[PDB]
Design a protein around this ligand. Structure first.
Ligand SMILES: NC(=O)c1ccc[n+]([C@@H]2O[C@H](COP(=O)([O-])OP(=O)(O)OC[C@H]3O[C@@H](n4cnc5c(N)ncnc54)[C@H](OP(=O)(O)O)[C@@H]3O)[C@@H](O)[C@H]2O)c1
Ligand SMILES: Nc1nc(=O)c2nc(CNc3ccc(C(=O)N[C@@H](CCC(=O)O)C(=O)O)cc3)cnc2[nH]1
Length: 160
């Protein structure tokens, strides 16, 4: 089973200049770690270059059309291969970026979304999807506080 996890600002903005255009929200980073630990993660090369190091406790799988440049991770040249390299596991986590999210969306059964109340400019967006394909089953909104500079809402959607 394939899931996508992402944090989205207003208008589905997810990135700018290959970074994330808001301040780190530690509540959202904890949520990300909580929901990806001990699972395989699949990410595009540009996202790999943004994170800058293997996420620990996870099987890191990078998509690129070009041979790999780091043997701490697992490189693959196509979507099918990326799924194949995860093995027989309960849940594969796709961690972006925009182009990778768009390819995995039709295969996904679960979206893990953080809705952040920030109004920033971006160059990368989360893919358009069809609201009638999905069912919202968890929703948790929190206000901003001393550690988290925007209000945010965790949501999980399951494919109907
Ligand atoms: N807010 C969030 O939750 C979040 C999460 C993740 C990323 N981001 C942001 O998203 C942005 C990056 O997104 P992006 O769309 O530019 O890049 P991306 O999707 O992360 O990476 C695209 C790259 O992945 C490779 N790739 C994708 N599909 C492939 C396929 N089917 N076969 C072989 N290779 C494939 C290609 O690498 P090659 O060029 O080497 O062939 C490619 O150009 C950054 O700003 C990042 O910070 C935000
Ligand atoms: N919900 C969500 N939030 C994000 O920040 C996010 N970011 C990406 C890609 N960017 C990154 C950047 C940093 C880390 C990261 O440092 N995670 C560490 C610790 C985070 C922390 O210090 O709190 C980890 O171990 O998971 C992960 C993904 C993909 N999906 C996301 N999904």
């Amino acid at each position: 089973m394939i899931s996508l996890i992402a944090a989205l600002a207003v208008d589905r903005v997810i990135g700018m200049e290959n970074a994330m255009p808001w301040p780190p929200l530690p509540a959202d980073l904890a949520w990300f770690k909580r929901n990806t630990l001990n699972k395989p993660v699949i990410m595009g090369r540009h996202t790999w270059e943004s994170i800058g190091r293997p996420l620990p406790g996870r099987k890191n799988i990078i998509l690129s059309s070009q041979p790999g440049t780091d043997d701490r991770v697992t490189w693959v040249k196509s979507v099918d291969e990326a799924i194949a390299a995860c093995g027989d596991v309960p849940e594969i986590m796709v961690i972006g970026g925009g182009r990778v999210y768009e390819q995995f969306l039709p295969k996904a059964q679960k979206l893990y979304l953080t809705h952040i109340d920030a109004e920033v400019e971006g160059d990368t967006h989360f893919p358009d999807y069809e609201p009638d394909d999905w069912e919202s089953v968890f929703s948790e909104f929190h206000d901003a506080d001393a550690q988290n500079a925007h209000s945010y809402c965790f949501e999980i959607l399951e494919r109907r």
